[PDB]
Amino acid sequence: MISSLWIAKTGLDAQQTNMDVIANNLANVSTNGFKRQRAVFEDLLYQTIRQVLQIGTGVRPVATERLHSQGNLSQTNNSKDVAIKGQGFFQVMLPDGTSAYTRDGSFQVDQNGQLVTAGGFQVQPAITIPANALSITIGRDGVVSVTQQGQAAPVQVGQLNLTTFMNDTGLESIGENLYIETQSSGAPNESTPGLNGAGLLYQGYVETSNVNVAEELVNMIQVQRAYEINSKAVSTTDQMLQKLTQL
Amino acid sequence: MISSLWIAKTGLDAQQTNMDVIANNLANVSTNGFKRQRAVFEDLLYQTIRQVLQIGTGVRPVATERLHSQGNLSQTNNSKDVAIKGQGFFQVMLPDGTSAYTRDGSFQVDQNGQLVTAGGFQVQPAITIPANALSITIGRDGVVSVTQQGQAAPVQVGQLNLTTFMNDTGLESIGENLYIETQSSGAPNESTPGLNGAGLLYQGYVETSNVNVAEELVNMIQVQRAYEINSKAVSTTDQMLQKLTQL
């Protein structure tokens, strides 16, 4: 009755949410530095009547759980492309003054010669970009050691450190592969790149998504199948309902 | 339901836009002084319900992002062909009075003896072209030091400077490999060629497109494959839809 009603309901929304999770987890290929999520089906409190006579409740997905793994990467060969071998996150300023974190390989200049990224999102710490800076020879740990015209020297026009945290599951994607520090994110530490969990700067390259598709295509197929099996359970429930409202 | 609907929609248009981007990025070989674009897939705001129970949205391509790299170049050996070693952009007048910028190696004369390009688009600054000017010995920095008939001297009949900017991503192709100054383009500076980021004049030659094809052919293949995988996701979604409208 109401038992099969709510049980079919929670199986329906569990399989629906699983379908939406893997559906959003297949379309996010070529998202830069991306870590993919997945739901975990878990029960609820059971209800024992007598020592063992229980009831049993719950098939619930708890939450979508991230997978912080370095995905595929591409050899792009541009000075405005920097990947990070291993871990360590970037630190860039949002234009409202707040910070941001990412794994990005696409940075630009504004009209006023500052270093920004993603079409005008300034870095942390900020770097002014000249026009006579011919070559851009970036050090592995933030040393923006460019060479200007008439200046035959790798002039360090900027120094950058990498921010590390304690639980990157608490970090949340806040729009176009950006992250900010949350409660469960951990404590920030812009340590020197190459130490304390931070990687180094690979100039010329980008990071991308850790999206394994064919495994999650099998997951799509089996979640569709379990959605249809929940539909079969609803069909049997409503067949009993119509045969008993005939009764 | 609507979740899988919009998710399949944005994966569909992301892969479609990627296919169109690489499709337009393969046909533009032999375009002179050309810098090729590419889209970047990026998420949107996620939606946390509880400290970590999120929702997650976005696979969006942000924009097509240019790659300002010197492509292939050809040895053409004509005085109306001038390439630029390195950087520095040309400055030519549009016939409505406005300026234009390019990396061109094909310039002409009008009926009235002025220096134009691309079939009647005047240079900046303008140069009058005589008829007794036998040889055209162009200096490396705009010195149009031609030698006229009866005048055994490299008569400088024109001086040209090269315009530099601050963010060439803001420059937009405004028709037949032309560019004009935009907001994000940077500040113009027609400095002497050979300094402040400007190159020199290579008389006899042209610049061309930075189009790497086989890498982007692999990109075409994988975007076709991901388009088909999004089609498989739509197929599973609609199979659940038809089996549940059977229910």
Next chain:
Amino acid sequence: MISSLWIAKTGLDAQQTNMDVIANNLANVSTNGFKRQRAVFEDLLYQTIRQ
């Protein structure tokens, strides 16, 4: 999946860059006092999960 995608990508661009390097290294005969270049294929960081 993405693994074979990027692996085929970096093998493709490595062999392409090698082809361009030897291609530019064969046309530069009779260049005066010239010293020729060559690329060196090298790995990246490996990723150990367990000893």
Next chain:
Amino acid sequence: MISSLWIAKTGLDAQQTNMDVIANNLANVSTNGFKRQRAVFEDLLYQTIRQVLQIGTGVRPVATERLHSQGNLSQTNNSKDVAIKGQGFFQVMLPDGTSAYTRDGSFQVDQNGQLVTAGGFQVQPAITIPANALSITIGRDGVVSVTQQGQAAPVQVGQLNLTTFMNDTGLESIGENLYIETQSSGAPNESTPGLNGAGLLYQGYVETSNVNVAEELVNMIQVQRAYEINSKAVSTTDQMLQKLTQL
């Protein structure tokens, strides 16, 4: 049901990981001093119910297992190229102060006249490189017996020993054909080259990868075929699934 689901899953990821392993094992030709890896498919615990009524689980790849064999080598004839006949590993300093190990044949000088390699990675022990050192006559066991201008003698400007270990499978490639001592790597011993497993210095030459391709091309073909056969197993499983959700 779930049995065929997880069995198809582990066969799918086993064949996928095998495909990625041989795919990364075919692109690493001309990597210097390289030893190639390979996965090993192995079962899990079986589950006997009665003395023999078992269940049986596992097709798992355990890990990628290196093959420490000397590959192909090339006659390069440069004093900055040194191969090692047989075994024995180099010892070079990483710029953070830590050591490194390799089989390299490409070493350089810095701006400040020290001996480095790979574009500025100093050797262990460090050697200062003069400018009047005309010829570089390297001894077979680290004797950098160069001859300086005005000094008609093989002046030993450096001595080098070779580091040996106990299990080179524990050594891990830490970026651009470098290695460092790990737990399973063994104990280091920079013995004299030519003894205790160490080879000698072949000035003029390099070592390279032990990549046999056509055998591993047959491996690529058969892993593709077994991937398709796992796909056939998934197809039969889902055909039973759809014919039984018809039931």
